Amino acid sequence: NDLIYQDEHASLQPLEGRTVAVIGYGIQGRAFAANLRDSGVAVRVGNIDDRYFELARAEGHRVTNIAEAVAHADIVLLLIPDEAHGAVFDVDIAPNLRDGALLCVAHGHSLVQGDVRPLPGRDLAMLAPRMYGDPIRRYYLAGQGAPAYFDIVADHTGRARDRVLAIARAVGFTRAGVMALGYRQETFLDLFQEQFLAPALVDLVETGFQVLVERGFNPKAALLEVYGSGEMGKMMLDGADIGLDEVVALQGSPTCQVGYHRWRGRTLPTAVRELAARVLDQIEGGDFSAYLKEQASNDYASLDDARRAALKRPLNVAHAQVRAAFRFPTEAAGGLYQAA
Amino acid sequence: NDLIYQDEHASLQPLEGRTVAVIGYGIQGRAFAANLRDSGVAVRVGNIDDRYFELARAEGHRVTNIAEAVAHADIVLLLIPDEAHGAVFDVDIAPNLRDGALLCVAHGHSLVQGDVRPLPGRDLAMLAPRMYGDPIRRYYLAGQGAPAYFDIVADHTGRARDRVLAIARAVGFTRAGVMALGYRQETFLDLFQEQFLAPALVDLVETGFQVLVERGFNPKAALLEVYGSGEMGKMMLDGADIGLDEVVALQGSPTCQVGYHRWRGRTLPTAVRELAARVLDQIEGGDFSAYLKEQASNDYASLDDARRAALKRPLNVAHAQVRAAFRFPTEAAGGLYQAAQAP
Ligand SMILES: NC(=O)c1ccc[n+]([C@@H]2O[C@H](COP(=O)([O-])OP(=O)(O)OC[C@H]3O[C@@H](n4cnc5c(N)ncnc54)[C@H](O)[C@@H]3O)[C@@H](O)[C@H]2O)c1
Ligand SMILES: NC(=O)c1ccc[n+]([C@@H]2O[C@H](COP(=O)([O-])OP(=O)(O)OC[C@H]3O[C@@H](n4cnc5c(N)ncnc54)[C@H](O)[C@@H]3O)[C@@H](O)[C@H]2O)c1
Ligand SMILES: [Mg+2]
Ligand SMILES: [Mg+2]
Ligand SMILES: [Mg+2]
Ligand SMILES: [Mg+2]
């Protein structure tokens, strides 16, 4: 059956007198580094010479090049982009990773592609959060956490498991649950969410917007209804708690419930299911890996073009107009990652 | 060209010495009643003899039958299901609505069907929140608000507009924005969200779950990724703030962004937009209106069956298994609708 660790199944004892090198200070790196520090764990940041290095220094961390961070650490968290794992692993990590040290990745992709490998005398694990940084940090400060998947890939020490789960406890994942799952299955699940589900959800919101605008509806009202009001986001996030069909049962007017249940299970043709299968085949069969390696070279120039093009889509032009005219509920983020 | 009111464009002055009758204490009724009370507005609840009547009493409101609430009110908010509007308006509201009093609906449907009509000497308006009750209440207490649309249908007094916007300010909608929109267009927009977009989003989440499970993926993990983790919910909520493509640009790893942009705009066949058009045709043409009255005529017996049947779906079986095994971050809701300070 499933193996799920919560607070009662993990301790910070294994991190006593140990230094964690957080490699990278991006979406994941910044949240791990902040949460580890506030949990009373000795933390160092290893980063290349870019804005994240300066940010780590600004937020009161000990910041060096990656090689120096790895050399001075008992546990190394490789929280940089997956395509950068190969070169950073071979040049900066492997040569400096001490005897009996633990290397952790937060995604199985580099393990699947063979860019990160078990090293003699050393431990290798995946601790893969099911959430991005800002929520991981906000949850942690409220005494809450996001779920994670973990895999002990190589355990020379025999202590990898408790050290990985101690990191997971210190960063807050054990407040939700840390489930045993193979790095291979994590990779395919994770890439599936990013390549089928997220695009298809945004494509559908966009489809609702475009059809309403085509048929003479107020573009601001169209944008608000399909997501801009936050209603669809609230339904999906409350749904994570009580279930999606249950949100409609509890929070829906009878008119809303009658309409919802008329089309529930009837909106999507078989082609959607088939395209999801096609995306999974591309992820598993090496097609996506080749596409990603291509896109990575020239420092993701293609991705930059795609990002700028997206902002000029009618949906995102309409978003800008709505957000200028309607105040959205936000929380102050100033010093969110400074010491607690 | 849009007319959008924020806090600077409304005041509570028009509610000075006025009593608001909140008809219903449901998803909308409870939030309006709570926020109005905390804003220092005199509120009474009119409700039929059910669990909502007792809840209103438990939460410290002056509670009576609908007719008595209306008879003692300057402003009446009709916050009960749309199919109940006709009978309640004819029997309970119209005969008891004072000269120069304002009646507000939170949805245009009863106005489009003619179940709620302008009355000589009285004001008629729509104030339609773009949000359900709990967030309306939570936002209010945080000094924030949900957006709303409004339409002045009949204005005998010539003061309908300022009184409607005063209610909107009292319940917090002006902290986000309250936009002028015809009750007809609101009806079609609102029903479209409920009949195309919400079902299709859940259908899409379910498709993701089914495909992963049918290919041997861990059912708990499949459920977490497609919504159960809260990640897709957070993306869509953060997206409402900064934009959906912008959330991916800011919070997505480069691996995630490369994957997202590979399929963005390519996932859906033309049949999806065709169905969207078909749903609007059913909404606009009277097909849905007839379907709803049929469903209501048996006290929503078919809906009760559909609700129970939905809990047996593999997605909702997996949800229960995930929720028993993983603790989810939630705020305590115990005190949510009891008296608070004005923010
Ligand atoms: N973003 C998420 O929601 C998320 C979720 C779970 C796991 N992860 C995983 O965490 C890891 C980090 O992803 P992220 O989203 O934090 O990325 P990010 O884009 O925020 O990473 C930026 C960081 O990586 C460093 N970096 C970038 N290119 C580098 C290079 N060539 N060499 C060395 N350092 C480099 C930067 O200096 C900075 O510290 C990845 O393995 C990713 O798959 C991300
Ligand atoms: N739910 C939403 O998110 C939402 C959003 C905006 C507008 N609205 C509108 O608000 C109004 C109320 O919807 P809701 O979601 O609060 O509904 P609800 O299901 O929560 O309504 C329950 C309330 O209606 C009363 N009620 C039910 N049947 C009645 C009847 N036959 N006669 C008298 N009272 C009756 C109950 O006693 C209770 O007070 C509707 O016009 C709806 O379209 C709802
Ligand atoms: Mg992920
Ligand atoms: Mg509605
Ligand atoms: Mg609505
Ligand atoms: Mg990922």
Residue numbers in the entry:
A (entry chain A): 2 to 341
B (entry chain B): 2 to 344
Question: Can you list sentences taken from the study reporting this PDB entry?
Answer:
A trait of BP bacteria is a conserved gene cluster coding for the biosynthesis of polyketides (malleicyprols) with a reactive cyclopropanol unit that is critical for virulence. We show that BurG, an unusual NAD+-dependent member of the ketol-acid reductoisomerase family, constructs the strained cyclopropanol ring. A sequence similarity search using BLAST predicted that BurG belongs to the family of ketol-acid reductoisomerases (KARIs; EC 1.1.1.86), well-characterized enzymes that play key roles in the biosynthesis of branched-chain amino acids. Biochemical assays and a suite of eight crystal structures of native and mutated BurG with bound analogues and inhibitors provide snapshots of each step of the complex reaction mechanism, involving a concealed oxidoreduction and a C–S bond cleavage.
To gain more insight into the reaction mechanism and the role and position of NAD+ in the enzyme, we performed protein crystallography. We raised crystals of holo-BurG in the absence or presence of 7 as surrogate and solved the structures at a resolution of 1.8 Å and 1.9 Å, respectively. Indeed, HR-LCMS analysis of a denatured BurG preparation revealed the presence of the nucleotide cofactor NAD+. The amino acid residues Asn48 and Asp51 exclude the negatively charged phosphate group of NADP+ from binding in the active centre of BurG. A co-crystallized glycerol molecule (used as cryoprotectant) maps the entire specificity pocket next to the catalytic centre. The positioning of NAD+ in the active site of BurG indicates that an oxidation event occurs during cyclopropanol formation. The head region (C1–C3) of all co-crystallized ligands was consistently found to be firmly locked in a conserved binding mode that is facilitated by interactions with the two Mg2+ ions of the enzyme (e for unliganded holo structure).
